[PDB]
Amino acid sequence: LNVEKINGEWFSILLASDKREKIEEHGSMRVFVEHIHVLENSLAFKFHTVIDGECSEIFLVADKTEKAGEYSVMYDGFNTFTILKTDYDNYIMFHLINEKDGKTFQLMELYGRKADLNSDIKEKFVKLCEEHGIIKENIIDLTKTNRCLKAR
Ligand SMILES: Cc1cnc(C)cn1
Ligand SMILES: [Cl-]
Ligand SMILES: [Cl-]
């Protein structure tokens, strides 16, 4: 992948986990991307999240690890992630693994360059989730949730 080409503004579209509580309201991973800045050794993210009904910002920096294509970041424990698929100018799919207290879960995210994506791309992401043991009932379409768009 040419990671420089993922730079810029993105929107969170679909959000999925094999630990559903983490992506429900008040879950730590119910976060909405605004941008990804590509740096030499890292990716800098800005997110929003809802806390007690109010939009709030989260800024994270993910560092390259010793494994090609993998990044790590501390947020509600220790996370690693990789990019599964992208065409740079419409969609990107991430796969992240969280560790906390020696337990783990997966998070998968579909971001778009616009506030929504078509049904074809969504469907393909759902199948990719299933390929990781993330069942359809654990995939949330954030376009029908509060994504703090007004806060962007
Ligand atoms: C919290 C978080 C979620 N997703 C990515 C890709 C990075 N950080
Ligand atoms: Cl809480
Ligand atoms: Cl919204």
UniProtKB/Swiss-Prot annotation:
What compartments host this protein?
Secreted
Question: Principal localization?
Answer: secreted
Disulphide bridges: C55-C148
Q: Name one GO cellular component term.
A: extracellular space
This protein's UniProt keywords: Disulfide bond, Pheromone-binding, Secreted, Signal, Transport
Query: So which tissues is this one expressed in?
Result: Expressed in lacrimal gland, parotid gland, sublingual gland, nasal mucus, and vomeronasal organ.
Q: Which InterPro entries match?
A: Calycin, Lipocalin, Lipocalin_CS, Lipocln_cytosolic_FA-bd_dom, Maj_urinary
The record's GO molecular-function terms, alphabetically, read: insulin receptor activity; pheromone binding; small molecule binding
GO BP term, pick one: negative regulation of lipid storage
One Pfam family this sequence matches: Lipocalin
Quote the function comment for this protein: Binds pheromones, likely to displace pheromones complexed to urinary MUPs and transport them to the vomeronasal organ (VNO) where they associate with their neuronal receptor(s). MUP4 is highly specific for the male mouse pheromone 2-sec-butyl-4,5-dihydrothiazole (SBT).
Q: Which family does it belong to?
A: Belongs to the calycin superfamily. Lipocalin family.
The protein's name is Major urinary protein 4
